[PDB]
């Protein structure tokens, strides 16, 4: 029941998806051949949320992989747990968007999306009671942002009442590798805000920073960044698959974190994280978790919440713990730092307890917070975008296939509208 399908798009998205299914399968005890070898009966009770049952009793994930380049599949297929995916679900072209939003949205995505949208119907129609969709993609690449945002429109257009999530990676100027990142990122966020129910921003800059500061490992790699995101992804829907004191599905979090319909851009963080040098020195307690929960450096974004005011906060506790400690700690944090919390919404922190902790850690926490500090990331992207656009630089490739300048200007104003509107509540008082 309330099962959800998985869609990953682009080269960056597939890497997230490949590691995510490795994390979930280990949690549910599914071998790379898809045969269940678990120990407890709870591991199979709610396995229909993410998996489908085929002939012979094996389990196959309900994930749809898309791209515009055939190089992507042979790396993910040849990797560990690459045999779980149904070969019929691979849909992608042969040319590639070339880090161009227009190509991935106008001239090639349109011709191909009819095929991928079919298997989306096949997966969604087979569900007895669909809960929602989740999309993984990056906002710095062409096909990831291009086809990725266009699916958001058509999926929403056919399933309006369902819930929608996007784990989007935005480009940061500190670590940037493509000169047209400001262009395609600006256009995507225009279409994303109209359709996505919940959006989550993840930064490579913060992921590199958290690895250097907390984990203190000498050389991070794309495996580490993928795993940190995948750990937080499973925590969001953990209580949906396992019992707990206060179960809280996807819809419940959406209601309690969105005061107004256009404010649905969250930043997430995970705890506890510690280097194995100090792993045996730390003491795992509920007060210990919440201190690292609200740490500014622990956030998966470079937007500092201390530069703004929290609107709403959500905490999902995992493990065997008491309710009184959970309730009292949120109250104490909300009182010790009352300056950082907007005042006309009293007690604006939500809590949930699931008593099946992640493997390895006795207790763990995922944090989802809506704060006014995220506006500065849209601003700094806009500053770069408006700098290049005034001189018409790198433009004839976007305008060479039907796109025109009014689309860029229209995206500029609406994005500027969103940020100006988003800081309205930062200074608003009762």
């Amino acid at each position: 029941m309330r099962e959800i399908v998985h869609i990953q798009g682009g080269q960056c998205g597939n890497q997230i998806g490949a590691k995510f299914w490795e994390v979930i399968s280990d949690e549910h005890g599914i071998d790379p051949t898809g045969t269940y070898h678990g120990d407890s009966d709870l591991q199979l009770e709610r396995i229909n949320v993410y998996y489908n049952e085929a002939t012979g009793g094996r389990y196959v994930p309900r994930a749809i992989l898309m791209d515009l380049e055939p190089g992507t599949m042979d790396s993910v297929r040849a990797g560990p747990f690459g045999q779980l995916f149904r070969p019929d679900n691979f849909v992608f072209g042969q040319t590639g968007a070339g880090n161009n939003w227009a190509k991935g949205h106008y001239t090639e995505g349109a011709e191909l999306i009819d095929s991928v949208l079919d298997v989306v119907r096949k997966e969604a129609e087979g569900c007895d009671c669909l809960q929602g969709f989740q999309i993984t993609h990056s906002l710095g690449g062409g096909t990831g942002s291009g086809m990725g945002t266009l699916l958001i429109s058509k999926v929403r257009e056919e399933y309006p009442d369902r819930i929608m999530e996007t784990f989007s990676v935005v480009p940061s100027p500190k670590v940037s590798d493509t000169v047209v990142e400001p262009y395609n990122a600006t256009l995507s966020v225009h279409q994303l805000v109209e359709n996505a129910d919940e959006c989550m921003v993840i930064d490579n800059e913060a992921l590199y920073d958290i690895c250097f500061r907390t984990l203190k490992l000498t050389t991070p790699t794309y495996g580490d960044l993928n795993h940190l995101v995948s750990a937080a992804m499973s925590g969001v829907t953990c209580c949906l698959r396992f019992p707990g004191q206060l179960n809280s599905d996807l819809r419940k979090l959406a209601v309690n974190l969105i005061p107004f319909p256009r404010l649905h851009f969250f930043m997430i963080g995970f705890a506890p994280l510690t280097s194995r040098g100090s792993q045996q020195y730390r003491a795992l307690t509920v007060p210990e978790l919440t201190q690292q929960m609200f740490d500014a450096k622990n956030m998966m974004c470079a937007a500092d919440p201390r530069h703004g005011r929290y609107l709403t906060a959500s905490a999902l506790f995992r493990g065997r713990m008491s309710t009184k400690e959970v309730d009292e700690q949120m109250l104490n944090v909300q009182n010790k730092n009352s300056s950082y919390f907007v005042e006309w919404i009293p007690n604006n922190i939500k809590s949930s307890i699931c008593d099946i902790p992640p493997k390895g850690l006795k207790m763990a926490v995922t944090f989802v917070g809506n704060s006014t500090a995220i506006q500065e990331m849209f601003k700094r992207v806009a500053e770069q975008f408006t700098a290049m656009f005034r001189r018409k630089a790198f433009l004839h490739w976007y305008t060479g296939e039907g796109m025109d300048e009014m689309e860029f200007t229209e995206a500029e104003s609406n994005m500027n509208d969103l940020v100006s509107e988003y800081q309205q509540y930062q200074d608003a008082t009762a």
Partner: protein, 47 residues
């Protein structure tokens, strides 16, 4: 003719590099756990 001649020159490194860059290198806490629910531990059959 003197410069270009028949030369003797003679994927494991590629695979080793590829697997490492997707690897963990840092694992997580070590697992002492056994699955048990909160509603099943408190409510037990009495004599």
């Amino acid at each position: 003719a003197k410069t270009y001649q028949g030369k003797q020159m003679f994927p494991e490194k590629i695979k080793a590099l590829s697997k490492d860059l997707r690897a963990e290198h840092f694992k997580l806490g070590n697992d002492p756990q056994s699955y048990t629910s909160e509603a099943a531990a408190k409510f037990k059959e009495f004599d």
